[PDB]
Design a protein around this ligand. Sequence first.
Ligand SMILES: Nc1ncnc2c1ncn2[C@@H]1O[C@H](COP(=O)(O)OP(=O)(O)NP(=O)(O)O)[C@@H](O)[C@H]1O
Ligand SMILES: Nc1ncnc2c1ncn2[C@@H]1O[C@H](COP(=O)(O)OP(=O)(O)NP(=O)(O)O)[C@@H](O)[C@H]1O
Ligand SMILES: Nc1ncnc2c1ncn2[C@@H]1O[C@H](COP(=O)(O)OP(=O)(O)NP(=O)(O)O)[C@@H](O)[C@H]1O
Ligand SMILES: Nc1ncnc2c1ncn2[C@@H]1O[C@H](COP(=O)(O)OP(=O)(O)NP(=O)(O)O)[C@@H](O)[C@H]1O
Ligand SMILES: [Mg+2]
Ligand SMILES: [Mg+2]
Ligand SMILES: [Zn+2]
Ligand SMILES: [Zn+2]
Lengths: 743, 743
Amino acid sequence: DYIVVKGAREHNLKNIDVKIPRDKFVVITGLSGSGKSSLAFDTIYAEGQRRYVESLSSYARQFLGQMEKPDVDYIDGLSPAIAIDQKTTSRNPRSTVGTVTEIYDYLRLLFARIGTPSQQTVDQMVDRIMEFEEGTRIQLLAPVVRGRKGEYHKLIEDIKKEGYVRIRVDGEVVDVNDPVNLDKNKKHNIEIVVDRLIVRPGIQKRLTDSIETVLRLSNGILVVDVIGGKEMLLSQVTIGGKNIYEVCCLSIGEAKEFFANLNLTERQQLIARQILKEINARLGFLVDVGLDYLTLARAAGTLSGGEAQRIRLATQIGSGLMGVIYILDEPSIGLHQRDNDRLLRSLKKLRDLGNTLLVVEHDEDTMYASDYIIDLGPGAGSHGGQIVAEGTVEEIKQNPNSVTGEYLSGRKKIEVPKERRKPNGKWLEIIGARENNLKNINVRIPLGVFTCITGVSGSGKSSLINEILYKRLAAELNRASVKPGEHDLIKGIEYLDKVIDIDQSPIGRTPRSNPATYTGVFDFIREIFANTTEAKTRGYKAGRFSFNVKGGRCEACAGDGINVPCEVCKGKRYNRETLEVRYKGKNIAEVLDMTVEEALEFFKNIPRIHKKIETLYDVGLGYIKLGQSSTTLSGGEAQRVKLATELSRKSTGKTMYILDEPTTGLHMADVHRLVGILHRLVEAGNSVVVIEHNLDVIKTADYIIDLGPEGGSGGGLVVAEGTPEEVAKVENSYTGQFLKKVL
Amino acid sequence: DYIVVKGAREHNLKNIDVKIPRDKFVVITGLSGSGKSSLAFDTIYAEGQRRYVESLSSYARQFLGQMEKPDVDYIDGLSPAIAIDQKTTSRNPRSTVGTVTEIYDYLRLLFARIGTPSQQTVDQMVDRIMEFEEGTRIQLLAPVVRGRKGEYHKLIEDIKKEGYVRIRVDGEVVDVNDPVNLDKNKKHNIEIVVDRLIVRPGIQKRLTDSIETVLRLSNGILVVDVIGGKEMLLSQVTIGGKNIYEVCCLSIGEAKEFFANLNLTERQQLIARQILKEINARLGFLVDVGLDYLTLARAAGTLSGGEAQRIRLATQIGSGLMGVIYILDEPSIGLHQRDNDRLLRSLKKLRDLGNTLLVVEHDEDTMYASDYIIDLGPGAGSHGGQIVAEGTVEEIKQNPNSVTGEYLSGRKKIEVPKERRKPNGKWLEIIGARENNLKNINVRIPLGVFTCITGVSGSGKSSLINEILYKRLAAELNRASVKPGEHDLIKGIEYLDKVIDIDQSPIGRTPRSNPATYTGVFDFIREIFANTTEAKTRGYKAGRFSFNVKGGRCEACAGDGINVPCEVCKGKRYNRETLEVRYKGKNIAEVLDMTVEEALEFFKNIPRIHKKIETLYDVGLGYIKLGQSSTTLSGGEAQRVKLATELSRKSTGKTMYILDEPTTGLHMADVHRLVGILHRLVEAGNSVVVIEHNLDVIKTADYIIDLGPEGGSGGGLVVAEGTPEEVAKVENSYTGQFLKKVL
DNA sequence: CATCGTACTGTTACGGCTCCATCGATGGAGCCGTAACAGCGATG
DNA sequence: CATCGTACTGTTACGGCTCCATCGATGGAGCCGTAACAGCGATG
Ligand SMILES: Nc1ncnc2c1ncn2[C@@H]1O[C@H](COP(=O)(O)OP(=O)(O)NP(=O)(O)O)[C@@H](O)[C@H]1O
Ligand SMILES: Nc1ncnc2c1ncn2[C@@H]1O[C@H](COP(=O)(O)OP(=O)(O)NP(=O)(O)O)[C@@H](O)[C@H]1O
Ligand SMILES: Nc1ncnc2c1ncn2[C@@H]1O[C@H](COP(=O)(O)OP(=O)(O)NP(=O)(O)O)[C@@H](O)[C@H]1O
Ligand SMILES: Nc1ncnc2c1ncn2[C@@H]1O[C@H](COP(=O)(O)OP(=O)(O)NP(=O)(O)O)[C@@H](O)[C@H]1O
Ligand SMILES: [Mg+2]
Ligand SMILES: [Mg+2]
Ligand SMILES: [Zn+2]
Ligand SMILES: [Zn+2]
């Protein structure tokens, strides 16, 4: 009935007790960094997996592996759990859609089980001959030589001595006793005539005996000579007329149609019902989410973000179970509203089978389509990790201590601008863009305003922007050695002086990385430290103060601090001599131990450091430490670190900003902060282009370039273009339909 | 609170609903073949394992594997389950006790984690030098050449050009500027003097700088020359003074003592607490059950039945968990009463940790030491598979519908004989028996009476009987080519004419085996069928009617009948022509489809077949089919088939019967049947020797030869010898102590 | 001590069948640190 | 058209570190089927 958790203390959680209803659609909600992932994935799934694994052999435990033991007193009401991680995976080039979805294994099993390559037994042969009409004259032959050249005299003598008298050679029956002649260089088909029977009921015994002796003499080969009829031969991989490659070269929808109407007998059904059911469920889920155009032979590395996310989901939740907790960590990454609604319908269908759904989400549609909501807060980092509200959507909305309820209820909102900026005659015209699935379209992107590129997941917006416009602009301005996509020409590059791009790619997590190193400010800090008088006296350089460089780092901990915390250097990753150069009475370890807000006051005089620290504060990461390990960063925190890294660069007043879905893992407040930053950048005279699926960002855009009307080969055309109201007035545009209810 | 099972239909179960209390000692009870194993192992454990496995990846599912899906409507209250199978396992010769118990892996991890092979950092070297007293004169050296021969002129010139002036050669300090001479064929130790410091507080910076430059110049080698003191060298697997082989060559008790008082610092404890805890738990369980004499390097194939069973238990239940169902299928195989009591104490300790115990048992001590009892019956095979009684021990005893309650309450019992047979001057004297752990004892075994060999598990009774007496008797009488054990001589063999032995070994389960083939009566049946007139007319032989021979078996099913049941031959494993030779109007398939009681009436005229069928009926297997697959036979049924096979042989009135614990897997009624058969054999003038642990069998024996007083190196001596009352009068004999409460 | 009588029982080798125990590495991608390269004004 | 000014910013190649995806076989033992081998009586 309930999953009772008491005394949860993982990461930033503070002894929180929660009762999660079972067999319900439960949504975990909070600010970015509050501890939803630590509450669900790091506690509930971790404990369930640990309990299941601990009852296994040492070989199995080593092969599978278990996560770290959570700091929870006791958790009850558990069951088998299937979890989808928040982090996106990068796949090998050899990987395939069918291999990732695991339909290839089921296809291989089906082909090895029921794939038809004639193997007949004695009884089957007897029945086959019995199928003939009564009165037909037949002869049973035992071919000893089939396609060979030789004198064949000893063999004939042995056959005659065995007892057989009738032998047919070259299709003519001759007596073995009478001498015969045959060319040694000419192929001959020597066959022994065993019996000359008649077809009538009641000769089963004699026919079976003759077939048995023929099979014994000819080693499993029987030839039935039908007098006046066509001769037949009896001896001891495609399904439905399609090979494995042929069935793997079809679309998902066509494969589902083929597997839905294939003709199978009772034996084949009883043999492969389970495999057919698994394949049907997987293909049905793939068609339901919207991936009915991809072929099963497509490489998984070439898929877009939304398609990759949907295939990752289909790998785990493709075939539903019963009595299993499903933990999904933001399954709506890079998905349009339509795709999110289809996923929600699939999730409700999965829950209706008798499953518990524990979905961590930042979306509002999931919030409105949820039975129960658990709110965490009231802040992020050390200021969160405790439940601030609980109940249904309405109770959360009426709750004054929940920020997400405040944003849902309209108390806090992102204002829709009263007046939108208009283009001033400067445009970027892309002519003949035919990259990937684009259909030779001409797109004009206004300069100096806020532009949003909208469209369904897979419609061709990343390929239009990142693969063509950004690459051409980089080659023109930054002199990068990258080749752009397929296009005729781009006009209007002379109006720009720089390009800054944030891509839609995973962020690498390493123990050698932290916000300071990622943003590039640690280099300035190290140079400042190495420029002091003490470092000059001791002959130190910038690499001495790096914990990844074996010049001043502690060798006991190998620069990591933990081997169990280190004791010689106290886990600070620096030896005692390095931790003596002090800038403003503070060494490098305490500088790394500062928060962003503290570093704002400490480094308020150095402009290069101050700009980056101010950007990190602006994206809302003021609570984070400058030296926190990147492996211990959340998805939203890592995304915001990347955003600050790219947005803390110099602006000349004519630069172009390109962002590829920068909202991933961001709560509605972080979206507000990002929107404010972007609009300030635009007001400074720059131009910002955002490939976005969020309606809160979209409704504040001055220009919108919709793409579609579908994904894959069904997309690649501009379906709407103009201000958000004009796009909303378009009937056939999905983004306009969803904007009509927002504006 | 409860594990609710509804609609269980696995094997012979008939829609039984059971509520098993949780966190209790629950014992499953019934006749042999009633369906206890199918109820527990084939339903509850199977469903739990299937549910846990289905939530895993395809790779993991293939690597681990899952059992067949049970025919159960729904089962609730499940949790992770650890199960010990009833079947005994045969291990490879290379296997070891430590490897089987899985202590070897933990030992390897401990040695790889904390095993000490001097790796020092700069700070550690500085601290070590600072440990010296104040005022001491030291010199830092960088040895560039250590044990080499050469002219060494370019190296000296390079060192001088670098800046260093002081170089010590052959232990004498010389100036690099002044010319020096050295033999090219003589080894020289060239060392560069870097600094000549003093020991006082406040020289940490200079000392660290000198150590760093010395380490850089000499590539991680530092030599500290203490003036007036012993020189020391600083540079950049045994635990507790014992190697891995040394710690693996100790006894289990000594290893536990060593691991209980080993000296470890805080770092080592924080590193390997989990490994130490696992090793301590495993060794504590091994000592508790009674295996405190085996060394961890002993081969597992040389262990006795009880030791092997205890080690198999310790593999799974050695380290306890919490909230886990433990399913044990007869864990008291080949164990004395004392060992069974120790195992019961361990099981109660395991249950007190918060675990559910589901123990299938035939013993009475387990019944009396159980919180809840579930009784199945009222018979075996198709006559059982339904719950006939339920409740505590007293309720079961008062229940009139439970046979086990009847035997517990004394309503049904095995009578103790009023008068015991006395030896008639014929004895079998074994002189100088020193096989295995025997201590050169002389044992006299009376002839013509019922003799029982008793003793603790491991005391040396199987080695005394099977390895010496049976092998010598076989070599003397049956002319077998087997070498006996270590003994001087055996007297009295001239009083015997034959020997029949039932060994304590596993029974192989193959699809090609059934009771008819195992007992050897199928050969007679096949000969009878091949001797008919129809088979003579069709030229058939005895191998034609064998389903394992490719002469008359169906090739579609390959003689197995199932490929999904076969359709051409209807799964009968014979082709249509073979199923036409009828003996008394019945072919081979219906003969194989007979029960033992049916075959008693059908074959009542053929004496050779009738004797074997009558023996199979006598051991109580009248409900079984003559052709039931051996893979679908229970442990008790297989044991009884083996017993009937060996006891259905000719008796000359002077044969010797040797049985090595024939009670394994037998309920108290099957024991009564076996005791009656054995006593009839003895009354026919034969002699029976039984190595038994069952008190019901023991109390009916005319003579008893106790062995002990312990197992392993602590046993091998006769502690009692005489009638059961005389043995009961012995104070130091465990068997006498347990018999005192029975007689 | 020789002769006769309507195809005899029990126990072992040997080949074929089947079940069960026992046992990380390589390439790809992202990131950090370091080296390398390009890019107002006044007077005679 | 030449001259002067108290160690300058931003973006790319390249090597080293680290995380993550992806992928049955062999010997031993037991059993079955087949071939192989050993083992009263009366008369002259
Ligand atoms: N291993 C760790 N040790 C200590 N703190 C951690 C660790 N991992 C994460 N944190 C911090 O704990 C807080 C909560 O992290 P997490 O539970 O991942 O957040 P989240 O709610 O899933 N946020 P997001 O996914 O961005 O919406 C953040 O401040 C993290 O930086
Ligand atoms: N390298 C490639 N080769 C072939 N087809 C590709 C390749 N990359 C992408 N595609 C396809 O091109 C179409 C558009 O993908 P893309 O333009 O990258 O995505 P998008 O429209 O931005 N969608 P998303 O990022 O998920 O919201 C999809 O059908 C992709 O599968
Ligand atoms: N796979 C099977 N299919 C059909 N019947 C089976 C199968 N396995 C076992 N049986 C029969 O089902 C009955 C119960 O078997 P099982 O559940 O193993 O008994 P059990 O109570 O554990 N007996 P035992 O272990 O000897 O004390 C017996 O008559 C078996 O012969
Ligand atoms: N091949 C062997 N080499 C060395 N020791 C052995 C061997 N076989 C058995 N032992 C040991 O000899 C002792 C007696 O074993 P054994 O006589 O076979 O058992 P048992 O007394 O009949 N006990 P059990 O059958 O379990 O009730 C035990 O300590 C065994 O570990
Ligand atoms: Mg998260
Ligand atoms: Mg059983
Ligand atoms: Zn250290
Ligand atoms: Zn068949």
